[PDB]
Amino acid sequence: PQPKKVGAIVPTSSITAKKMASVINPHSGLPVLELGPGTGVITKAILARGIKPESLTAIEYSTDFYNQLLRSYPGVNFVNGDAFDLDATLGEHKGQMFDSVISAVPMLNFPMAARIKLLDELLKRVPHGRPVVQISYGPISPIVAQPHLYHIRHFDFIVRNIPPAQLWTYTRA
Ligand SMILES: Nc1ncnc2c1ncn2[C@@H]1O[C@H](CSCC[C@H](N)C(=O)O)[C@@H](O)[C@H]1O
């Protein structure tokens, strides 16, 4: 028979969210950048690491989701805008460094060229060697290898996620 809720249209599992938030160093003194917070399940796992709410910046395109996040997570620096336009959402880069980037934007909704460019821009705003972590659902990295720009590592696989979740991490080469 025909299954409902095909694809990835339910919130990410709490098991997956905790694993993505485990890359964070809450003792580094640097804020965290979250992309595409949605219902806030990964936001919760980020705050559970002990990040001060004012030190979490989360960029959400949907105005409906954004208005609800403001009311559910007091103190967190939510921004209503497009994560692929970091200049418009974060401002022109003038030195701000994030501890790490936690991304759940749906990479496959965008051209590969856009994904590579965004990743190259995000790695300018974290210290050399620190990660971007991305969730995806296919068998391969959602962002193709460009070894002169970044290094790809498989981070984890969570079969209890609906659908099963692959986690990838990226660092500056
Ligand atoms: N370019 C973009 N910039 C900011 N947010 C985006 C975006 N494209 C998609 N989004 C938002 O990213 C989220 C993808 S769904 C994942 C939501 C949540 N983090 C979870 O894991 O369950 C949606 O909330 C969507 O509105």
| CATH code for the domain in which residue 38 is found | 3.40.50.150
With beta carbons less than 8 A apart as the criterion, state whether 18 and 42 touch.
no
Task: Please report whether residue 43 resides in a domain.
Answer: yes
Task: Please report whether residue 72 resides in a domain.
Answer: yes
Task: Please report whether residue 7 resides in a domain.
Answer: no
Task: Please report whether residue 2 resides in a domain.
Answer: no
| Ligand 1 site residues, Cβ closer than 6 angstroms | 11-12, 36-39, 41-42, 59-62, 65, 82-84, 104-106
Binding residue ranges for S-adenosyl-L-homocysteine: 12, 60, 82-83
Task: Please report whether residue 39 resides in a domain.
Answer: yes
Which residue range forms the structural domain that includes residue 151? 14-172
Which of 32, 62, 108, when mutated, tests ligand 1's pocket best, judged by the most ligand atoms within 8 Å of its CB? 62
Task: Please report whether residue 57 resides in a domain.
Answer: yes
Counting the structural domains of the chain, the total is: 1
Q: How many angstroms does the Cα of residue 113 sit away from the middle of ligand 1?
A: 19
Annotated resolution, angstroms = 2.0
Query: 11-14 long-range CB contacts below 8 Å, 24 or more apart?
Result: 11/38, 11/39, 11/41, 12/38, 12/41, 12/42, 12/104, 12/135, 12/161, 12/165, 13/41, 13/158, 13/160, 13/161, 13/162, 13/165, 14/41, 14/45
129 Cβ contact list (under 8 Å, min separation 6): 171, 172
Task: Please report whether residue 42 resides in a domain.
Answer: yes
Relative orientation angle of helices 14-21 and 41-48, to the nearest 10 degrees: 50
* C-alpha R_g of the chain: 15
Q: How far apart are CA 30 and CA 100, in angstroms?
A: 9
Task: Please report whether residue 141 resides in a domain.
Answer: yes
